[PDB]
Design a protein around this ligand. Structure first.
Ligand code: MET
Length: 517
């Protein structure tokens, strides 16, 4: 099925300002989207804001503004932050959007017509901050903001309260077997693998039914009303998860405003998501509830959910650090430092070590070497003479790299993709050191042509595969190398030899990444 590659971030609660968590999740979404564009595919990358619910209305109340003004202001802050971070997200969705509300109503009605929503009761614990129902085994003793004794969540440490309400209930318990079939038939559907095992164990234990409405007073009336029952409001998570469906059905103009909601998702060829990017805190909502809703509605299930090691929901301001160290460099660092865990060093010390060691010394040094007037005297891509075995060993690494990096990007595992590209960059550097092309200008011009050609081509291929990570710097490198625009994307240009000998380098001025103390 040739379709639009559909990648999403979570939609973030607007109770507080954009921080590194949100920026990280959206960065991952962006990188995946960029890689598929570089590959030549149609892409739709989605991000946005989750604006309804008790938690947002209470944050608005604290600031003494109306929820409408509060959500609009904070959404504006998220939008500004993502523009400054230089993402290439196709659409920014807000759950206050009238087209989103219509989709929530259609989905609700569909679930109700199937017999999967009934009127019942929830009596149990609830975390307002997580918008999450909890069994007594997921709570323990703790303290509130003040310090008085209370119950808290085992998941997040936030305060829990006992709720007793008549609620519309989704028959989640009826979907246990089908969810387990789905996990087993699609063993790459949740990444990384240990998070997939966690989900399976949880569903094997048994699933209760899920409350999907609340009484309107509890939510301070700041929510989507239930169709045909205005005393109730739709659970912020059914509302929130539905953004992915809404997003898949919006025609978007050249400036990013939604202009139209289509009736059938197949018309735009996005649904279901190829990758849902999430933090580990919302795994259950995405890997249990969401597919159960989709199964109930007869809608297709997402292909992959990737859950990263950070939380989604001592200051670290990403825009400040990016102004200090560079935007591409910060993005590189966030993606290189952590895989699917928290155990990872985010200090100025480590940022500088990676900036200096990998970006400046490995990549940047190598870009300057192969384009300098001292070594590349004609300022062009030379024609290679015959290859030695050592030449062939490096060429083989360069040729294998696109296949290797591609598999990593598709897992997705961006850290391993970066590591694989840099392994090849290190090998190119070792080769340049062995061949001493600076000596070869005088001693053996015929040999230098071969060495310089291989070096230029290794730099091109590595840079192409790093272009989703370093989108601006990749453009600078390609300009220095004189790579025509047509050769800067497309799977055809993953092949060794795509830029012919005779191609002129770009003009010189001059640093790519400047080292720090
Ligand atoms: C459908 S994704 C919703 C994510 C949620 N608003 C959060 O901040 O965790």
């Amino acid at each position: 099925v040739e379709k639009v590659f559909f990648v999403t971030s979570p939609i973030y609660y607007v109770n507080a300002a954009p921080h590194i968590g949100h920026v990280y999740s959206t960065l991952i979404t962006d990188v995946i989207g960029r890689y598929h564009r570089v590959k030549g595919e149609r892409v739709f990358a989605l991000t946005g804001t989750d604006e309804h619910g008790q938690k947002v209305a209470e944050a608005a109340k604290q600031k003494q503004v109306s929820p409408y003004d509060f959500t609009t202001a904070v959404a504006g802050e998220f939008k500004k932050c993502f523009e400054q971070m230089d993402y290439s997200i196709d659409y920014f969705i807000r759950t206050t959007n009238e087209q989103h509300k219509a989709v929530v109503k259609e989905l609700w009605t569909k679930l109700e017509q199937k017999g999967d929503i009934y009127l019942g009761r929830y009596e149990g614990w609830y975390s307002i901050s997580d918008e999450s129902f909890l069994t007594p085994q997921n709570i323990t003793d703790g303290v509130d903001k003040d310090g008085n004794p209370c119950k808290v969540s085992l998941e997040s440490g936030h305060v829990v309260t006992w709720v007793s309400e008549e609620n519309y209930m989704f028959r989640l318990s009826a979907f246990r077997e089908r969810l387990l079939e789905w996990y087993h038939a699609n063993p790459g559907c949740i990444v990384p693998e240990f998070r997939r095992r966690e989900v399976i164990r949880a569903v094997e234990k048994g699933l209760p039914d899920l409350s999907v409405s609340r009484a309107r007073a509890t939510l301070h009336n700041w929510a989507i009303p239930v169709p045909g029952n205005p005393d109730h409001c739709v659970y912020v998570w059914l509302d929130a998860l539905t953004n992915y469906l809404t997003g898949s059905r919006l025609r978007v103009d050249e400036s990013g405003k939604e202009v139209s909601l289509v009736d059938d998702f197949n018309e735009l060829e996005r649904f279901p998501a190829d990758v849902h990017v999430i933090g580990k805190d919302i795994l259950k909502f995405h890997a249990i509830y969401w597919p159960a809703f989709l199964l109930s509605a007869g809608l297709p299930l997402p292909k992959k959910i990737v859950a990263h090691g950070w939380w989604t929901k001592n200051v670290f301001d990403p825009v400040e650090k990016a102004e200090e160290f560079g935007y591409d460099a910060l993005k590189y660092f966030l993606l290189r430092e952590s895989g699917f865990s928290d155990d990872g060093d985010y200090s100025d010390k480590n940022m500088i070590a990676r900036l200096n060691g990998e970006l400046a010394d490995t990549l940047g040094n190598l870009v300057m070497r192969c384009t300098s007037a001292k070594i590349n005297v004609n300022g062009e891509w030379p024609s290679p003479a015959a290859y030695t075995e050592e030449d062939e060993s490096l060429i083989q690494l360069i040729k294998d790299l696109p296949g290797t990096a591609d598999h990593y990007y598709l897992i997705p595992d961006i850290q391993k993709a970066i590591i694989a590209v840099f392994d090849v960059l290190r090998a190119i550097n070792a080769y340049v050191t062995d061949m001493a092309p600076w000596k070869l200008v005088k001693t053996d011009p015929e040999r230098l042509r071969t060495v310089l050609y291989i070096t230029l081509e290794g730099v091109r291929v590595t840079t192409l595969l790093l272009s989703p990570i370093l989108p601006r710097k990749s453009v600078v490198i390609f300009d220095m190398l004189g790579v025509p625009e047509v050769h800067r994307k497309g799977i055809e240009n993953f092949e060794f030899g795509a830029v012919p000998p005779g191609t002129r380098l770009g003009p010189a001025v001059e640093v790519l990444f400047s080292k720090r103390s």
